[PDB]
Design an enzyme around this catalytic site. Structure first.
Site, PDB file in Angstrom:
ATOM      1  N   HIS A 118       2.080   4.552  17.511  1.00 48.74           N
ATOM      2  CA  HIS A 118       3.165   5.058  16.640  1.00 48.74           C
ATOM      3  C   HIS A 118       3.362   6.575  16.789  1.00 48.74           C
ATOM      4  O   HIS A 118       4.430   7.126  16.427  1.00 48.74           O
ATOM      5  CB  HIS A 118       2.823   4.805  15.153  1.00 48.74           C
ATOM      6  CG  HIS A 118       2.290   3.438  14.888  1.00 48.74           C
ATOM      7  ND1 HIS A 118       3.067   2.309  15.008  1.00 48.74           N
ATOM      8  CD2 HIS A 118       1.053   3.018  14.506  1.00 48.74           C
ATOM      9  CE1 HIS A 118       2.340   1.236  14.707  1.00 48.74           C
ATOM     10  NE2 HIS A 118       1.112   1.643  14.404  1.00 48.74           N
ATOM     11  N   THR A 123       4.591   8.136   5.086  1.00 48.97           N
ATOM     12  CA  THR A 123       5.819   7.698   5.716  1.00 48.97           C
ATOM     13  C   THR A 123       5.613   6.584   6.700  1.00 48.97           C
ATOM     14  O   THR A 123       6.550   6.264   7.469  1.00 48.97           O
ATOM     15  CB  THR A 123       6.580   8.853   6.398  1.00 48.97           C
ATOM     16  OG1 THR A 123       5.816   9.386   7.498  1.00 48.97           O
ATOM     17  CG2 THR A 123       6.779  10.038   5.361  1.00 48.97           C
ATOM     18  N   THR A 124       4.427   5.966   6.711  1.00 49.21           N
ATOM     19  CA  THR A 124       4.349   4.662   7.434  1.00 49.21           C
ATOM     20  C   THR A 124       3.652   3.676   6.463  1.00 49.21           C
ATOM     21  O   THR A 124       3.028   4.105   5.498  1.00 49.21           O
ATOM     22  CB  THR A 124       3.457   4.809   8.637  1.00 49.21           C
ATOM     23  OG1 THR A 124       2.210   5.345   8.188  1.00 49.21           O
ATOM     24  CG2 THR A 124       3.961   5.870   9.616  1.00 49.21           C
TER      25      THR A 124
HETATM   26  N1  LIG Z   1       3.406  10.151   8.286  1.00 45.65           N
HETATM   27  S1  LIG Z   1       2.368  10.643   7.031  1.00 45.65           S
HETATM   28  O1  LIG Z   1       2.861  10.131   5.763  1.00 45.65           O
HETATM   29  O2  LIG Z   1       2.074  12.044   7.167  1.00 45.65           O
HETATM   30  C1  LIG Z   1       0.816   9.799   7.243  1.00 45.65           C
HETATM   31  C2  LIG Z   1      -0.220  10.206   6.430  1.00 45.65           C
HETATM   32  N2  LIG Z   1      -1.420   9.646   6.503  1.00 45.65           N
HETATM   33  C3  LIG Z   1      -1.643   8.686   7.356  1.00 45.65           C
HETATM   34  S2  LIG Z   1      -3.255   7.927   7.408  1.00 45.65           S
HETATM   35  C4  LIG Z   1      -4.262   8.632   6.179  1.00 45.65           C
HETATM   36  C5  LIG Z   1      -3.934   8.408   4.836  1.00 45.65           C
HETATM   37  C6  LIG Z   1      -4.756   8.933   3.853  1.00 45.65           C
HETATM   38  C7  LIG Z   1      -5.880   9.688   4.213  1.00 45.65           C
HETATM   39  C8  LIG Z   1      -6.193   9.910   5.560  1.00 45.65           C
HETATM   40  C9  LIG Z   1      -5.393   9.369   6.576  1.00 45.65           C
HETATM   41  C10 LIG Z   1      -0.637   8.244   8.220  1.00 45.65           C
HETATM   42  C11 LIG Z   1      -1.019   7.097   9.145  1.00 45.65           C
HETATM   43  O3  LIG Z   1      -2.194   7.006   9.566  1.00 45.65           O
HETATM   44  N3  LIG Z   1      -0.091   6.138   9.457  1.00 45.65           N
HETATM   45  C12 LIG Z   1      -0.363   4.966  10.349  1.00 45.65           C
HETATM   46  C13 LIG Z   1      -0.335   5.370  11.829  1.00 45.65           C
HETATM   47  C14 LIG Z   1       0.714   6.452  12.147  1.00 45.65           C
HETATM   48  C15 LIG Z   1       0.334   7.736  12.095  1.00 45.65           C
HETATM   49  C16 LIG Z   1       1.212   8.710  12.330  1.00 45.65           C
HETATM   50  C17 LIG Z   1       2.519   8.479  12.597  1.00 45.65           C
HETATM   51  C18 LIG Z   1       2.949   7.186  12.687  1.00 45.65           C
HETATM   52  C19 LIG Z   1       2.014   6.179  12.450  1.00 45.65           C
HETATM   53  C20 LIG Z   1       0.652   8.761   8.114  1.00 45.65           C
HETATM   54 ZN   LIG Z   2       3.623  11.622   9.673  1.00 52.83          ZN
END
Ligand SMILES: NS(=O)(=O)c1cnc(Sc2ccccc2)c(C(=O)NCCc2ccccc2)c1
Ligand SMILES: [Zn+2]
Length: 257
Positions: free
Chosen positions: A69, A198-199
């Site tokens: 992603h 945002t995912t």
């Molecule tokens: N796009 S975002 O909202 O900034 C975000 C924030 N945290 C996480 S994983 C996570 C959550 C809580 C604590 C530590 C890691 C993720 C996230 O891990 N999303 C799933 C895989 C992904 C990652 C990045 C871009 C696209 C897909 C995304």
């Molecule tokens: Zn992000």
């Protein structure tokens, strides 16, 4: 059973996948991100002080990977931030980016309706014991092209060659997180609102910070993300447009420093 994807990936292949409008988890609720930030409607709040960074200065070799992603660097609690109106220190977990191959569509957030070429998210988690909607603090930097090479980014860009396919990882050359950020003067003005990941599963536990001033990278640095990275192990679909559509603000307000 189909799995989540961005629009560009349903459009570009035979894989049935859940486009953003059909994402599960908390993705259909009402404190979702990203959003459009009308900068004149964001009121100054003086509780929003400077951020302090720590371990950001330390030169390290980081693991960076293609998870299908985005490209993600694993930060392993080797750095932390506080201040910025946050209630406690937050430990840095991972940094990833969102991007396109055209200048006006790779950011997730927009400012006064303008979108940027990329958006970088540094995801942190609240340290416990200081006491849920602010468990995760994401620092979001908007990225646009500039005339100069952003040298701090070169070890990230160069590592992209080693992770073309989903599930590949590699190690970056020595590099510090501060090498990714602009000068501390550019970190003074930011916008703040409460939202979601945002995912999927789009949990509504994020305190968002969007810095007002974009980072600059050279156009070839930005293009490297879409030219070297793929959404598929066959490498038929370049990774770009990994961007969630804009969500409704609803009742929420945005404030700024
Ligand atoms: N796009 S975002 O909202 O900034 C975000 C924030 N945290 C996480 S994983 C996570 C959550 C809580 C604590 C530590 C890691 C993720 C996230 O891990 N999303 C799933 C895989 C992904 C990652 C990045 C871009 C696209 C897909 C995304
Ligand atoms: Zn992000």
């Amino acid at each position: 059973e189909s799995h989540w994807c961005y629009e560009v990936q349903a459009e570009s292949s035979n894989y049935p996948c859940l486009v953003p409008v059909k994402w599960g988890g908390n993705c259909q609720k009402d404190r979702q991100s990203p959003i459009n930030i009308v900068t004149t409607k964001a009121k100054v709040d003086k509780k929003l002080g400077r951020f302090f960074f720590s371990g950001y200065d330390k030169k390290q070799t980081w693991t960076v990977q293609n998870n299908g992603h985005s490209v993600m660097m694993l930060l392993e609690n080797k750095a932390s931030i506080s201040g910025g109106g946050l209630p406690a220190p937050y430990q840095a977990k991972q940094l990833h980016l969102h991007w396109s191959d055209l200048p006006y569509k790779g950011s997730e957030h927009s400012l006064d309706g303008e979108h940027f070429a990329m958006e970088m998210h540094i995801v942190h988690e609240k340290e416990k014991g200081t006491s849920p909607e602010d468990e995760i603090a994401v620092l979001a930097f908007l990225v646009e092209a500039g005339t100069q090479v952003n040298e701090g980014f070169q070890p990230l860009v160069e590592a992209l060659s080693n992770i073309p396919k989903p599930e590949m990882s590699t190690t970056m050359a020595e590099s510090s997180l501060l090498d990714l950020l602009p000068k501390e003067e550019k970190l003074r003005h930011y916008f703040r609102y409460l939202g979601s990941l945002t995912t999927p599963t789009c949990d509504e536990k994020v305190v968002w910070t969007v810095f007002r001033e974009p980072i600059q990278l050279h156009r070839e640095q930005i293009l490297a993300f879409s030219q070297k990275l793929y959404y598929d192990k066959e490498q038929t679909v370049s990774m770009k447009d990994n961007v969630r559509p804009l969500q409704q603000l609803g009742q929420r307000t945005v404030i700024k420093s």
